[model samples]
Target: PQITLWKRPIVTIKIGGQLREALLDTGADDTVLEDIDLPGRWKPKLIVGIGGFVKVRQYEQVPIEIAGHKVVGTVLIGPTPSNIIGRNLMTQLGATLNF
Candidate 1:
């Protein structure tokens, strides 16, 4: 779907029976999720943001249902201010941003 840049690209997403709001962030390189207690071991990784780099727990192949579209890919769990479905998942969802 073609999404607009105005306001925020927020959508409802289902993760392991839980539903929450996430952003289809074209600006973000990787998917970052917050307030989740997922099962399985994750690798520790750090990522760069506007201010600096923040540490996150990297998990692979996690399934998520966004706006009724299902996708499995790498997801990072951390203290992110908001959930972001980055360009990686955006490509899978065929989500485009434009004027």
Candidate 2:
């Protein structure tokens, strides 16, 4: 389905049995969330952001549900200003822009 881009495309998502609000960021290459505890191993890495690069913990095979659709993929946990669902998950949800 087509989703119109608002000033901040926010949506409710389920992760690790917890409901959280996230930003649908087409500009982002990967999904990033504020530090959260989930059952998985992580690899320390750096991510280049708008201002500069920041350290992040990369987790693989994380499951998340968007609008009742299940999607499993990599989710990066770090010190982000907000939770963001990037193109990676957006594409899986069959989301498209309508502008």
Candidate 3:
């Protein structure tokens, strides 16, 4: 999976037995997902970013399969513009940032 820089490296990911397209990012620290019917429980949490701050449900240890790479971590649920696969999961997926 040799992806080029300066482009949207989106990939299909599996979560809650559903496949979704997500933006793969190395700069993001937390993995945030859109409002889907995620099972189990979640906690209310507020996050700050370019679009200001808002409260979102934080689902812990939500297992996700990222383009065949599997890992589990904290996943935020709400209106996040798009499904973002961040470093929290990407770190485990073993993506080395190199030019």
Best by TM-score: 1
TM-score each candidate.
0.92, 0.89, 0.91
Candidate 1 residues lying further than 4 Å off, grouped into runs, are none
Number of the candidate with higher lDDT, 1 or 3 = 1
How many Å off is the CA of 87 in candidate 3? 0.8
Model 3 stretches with alpha carbons more than 4 Å out: none
Would you list the rank order by TM-score, best first?
Answer: 1, 3, 2
Could you give candidate 2's per-residue lDDT for residues 1-99 as a string of tens digits?
A: 455555677888899988988998889989999846788578998989788988888889899997678999889988899999999898898877765
Model 2 sits at a Cα RMSD from the real structure of: 1.5
Clashing pairs in 2: none
Candidate 2 to truth, TM: 0.89
List RMSD in Å for every model shown.
1.2, 1.5, 1.2
Against the reference, the lDDT scores of all candidates come to 0.87, 0.86, 0.85
Determine which window of 10 residues in candidate 2 has minimal summed lDDT.
1-10
Instruction: Give the distance in Å from residue 16's predicted Cα in candidate 2 to where it truly belongs.
Output: 0.8
